[PDB]
Design a protein around this ligand. Sequence first.
Ligand SMILES: Nc1ncnc2c1ncn2[C@@H]1O[C@H](COP(=O)(O)OP(=O)(O)O)[C@@H](O)[C@H]1O
Lengths: 427, 16
Amino acid sequence: ISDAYRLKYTFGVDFGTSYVKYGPITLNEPKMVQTRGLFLRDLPESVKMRIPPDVLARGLVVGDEEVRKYLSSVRDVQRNLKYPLKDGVARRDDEEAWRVLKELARYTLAQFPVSDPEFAGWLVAVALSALAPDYMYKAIFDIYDELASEFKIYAVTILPQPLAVAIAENAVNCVIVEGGHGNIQVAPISFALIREGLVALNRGGAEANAITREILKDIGYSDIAREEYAVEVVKRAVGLVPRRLKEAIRAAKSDPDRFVTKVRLSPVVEVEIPREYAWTRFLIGEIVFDPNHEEIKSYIEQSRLRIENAVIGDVTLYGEMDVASAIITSLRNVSVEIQERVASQIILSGGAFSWRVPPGMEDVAADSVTRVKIALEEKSPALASKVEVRLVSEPQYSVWRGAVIYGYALPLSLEWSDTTREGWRFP
Amino acid sequence: GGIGENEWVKILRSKR
Ligand SMILES: Nc1ncnc2c1ncn2[C@@H]1O[C@H](COP(=O)(O)OP(=O)(O)O)[C@@H](O)[C@H]1O
């Protein structure tokens, strides 16, 4: 296995809570597919008549185009659409979850054929949540060992998602904040992931969608709000992050016309945010950073929104803790020697931090870097005066880039150890 | 963001 070989045939797979990012090291950007599968059950004979036999026999479809093909036909898709990693962990005995993960592992390899004889298998590098227990590592290794009989696979390794971000950013000493649909992971990196400093929050992009849905109902779009794809489009289009929420709300109630907006959902369907509710745009961006505001609590009191802790194995995911407090807690839980190395660089990653400021709104609205700096200046002025905060260039692709760098560089002489939790396995 | 300048490459290649 030469150096040139590894620059062609390293293959990265990032298993996100809502999207899998995947493909060879030679791609300029990864491909993406939703982390879900559709079971084909209870279908009318009218519909089943025109489905290929091999697909009907399999009874489970993955791939965005393919799931879209059959979604209209399934009447009850809450029961039949399975999301195996919606909180980052597939439970040990959840057989449907692990079947969907194996099908996704198969589909992603199947998108990249062979046409060069000096190829003898991929070198696969998989990224999983820092929340993943030991049994998840074993089950993922098992999936790729089984698929090695269907595809040429030379070697396989696994690493945690926050470490991959640090590698992609060329940052050996830092604090990573990685936020997707399901949760936020906060972890210090000093030549390795410092486990004792991991802090997890039970909020993500799903919470921004949840409050968008409730705003839409209040405006009068309850029927639209029942469609998850539509809530997602509205969230991305109209969400705003305040510099400081109370100041942003006062501005939008004094001059609501600055903040009214419209969203086209289809050639026929359009949504309008009117004057009375224009200020609520700031709730959609704020909720991931800090949910402790009366205007958010109002929906909780109505039993229309949940903000709560969760427990997965040995880790508690905190519902209410704000992002700044999580950074400060993470540092407190590691030694002073490590703190002095990593506290200089805070790095935000993941799609939940993608927010942009519309032209003209710089007085009241913020991007994620600014919102986090404001929070740190309030809760720890000393830290704030010495730290640099940044957002990765491609928020959804950073983990995958670090996975392919890791797979390229990790020595092939380093065999997997259950004790150190690093190394290669060879099918 | 190039591989040649990435300090992690030397760190990872040193592992035994
Ligand atoms: N432009 C955007 N504005 C706001 N949120 C976004 C944007 N793009 C993506 N997102 C959100 O990012 C999340 C996806 O993050 P991602 O990094 O793929 O991790 P995961 O697969 O764990 O969800 C989703 O909740 C999605 O709605």
